[PDB]
Amino acid sequence: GHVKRPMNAFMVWARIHRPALAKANPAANNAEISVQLGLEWNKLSEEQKKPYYDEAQKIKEKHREEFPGWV
């Protein structure tokens, strides 16, 4: 609804990068770290974002293995 396809790719990128960013900027709280992750994500080129979108799609497909109709 409010969530669009970029968010799932961004969340892959964030899961990878948040822990080290939090430790490197430990005076910042989680909400501020989240803002910094979003700015870093938006500086990536379309080509750089591609593998995160590709991985988000693989994750989606793996989730759909739970559904009736898988195999």
Author numbering: 335 to 405
Sentences from the paper on this structure:
SOX proteins are a family of transcription factors (TFs) that play critical functions in sex determination, neurogenesis, and chondrocyte differentiation, as well as cardiac, vascular, and lymphatic development. There are 20 SOX family members in humans, each sharing a 79-residue L-shaped high mobility group (HMG)-box domain that is responsible for DNA binding. The L-shaped HMG-box comprises three α-helices: α1 and α2 that form one arm of the L (major wing), and α3 that forms the other arm of the L (minor wing). Here, we show that all SOX family members, except group H, interact with RNA.
Due to its inability to bind RNA, we sought to characterise the structure of the SOX30 HMG-box domain. Crystals formed in 0.1 M sodium acetate, 2 M ammonium sulphate, pH 4.6, and diffracted to 1.4 Å resolution. The crystal structure revealed that the SOX30 HMG-box domain contains the typical features of an HMG-box, including three α-helices and two disordered regions towards the N- and C-termini. Superimposing our SOX30 HMG-box domain structure on other available SOX protein HMG-box domain structures (alone and DNA-bound) demonstrated a very similar secondary structure between SOX family members, with a low RMSD. The C-terminal end of the SOX30 structure is seen to be orientated in a different direction to the other SOX structures. However, this is due to differences in crystal packing, with the SOX30 molecule within the asymmetric unit sandwiched between two adjacent SOX30 molecules, forming crystal contacts that stabilise the C-terminal end in this conformation. The seven amino acids at the C-terminal end of the HMG-box that we identified as critical for RNA binding (407-QPRPGKR-413; 73–79 HMG-box numbering) are not visible in the SOX30 structure. Structurally, the HMG-box domain of SOX30 retained all of the key features of other SOX proteins, with no obvious structural differences that would indicate why SOX30 does not bind RNA. Conversely, SOX30 has the sequence RPGKR, and thus has lost 40% of its positive charge within this cluster, which may contribute to the loss of RNA binding ability. Conversely, SOX30, which shows no RNA binding, features the sequence 70-WVYQPRP-76.
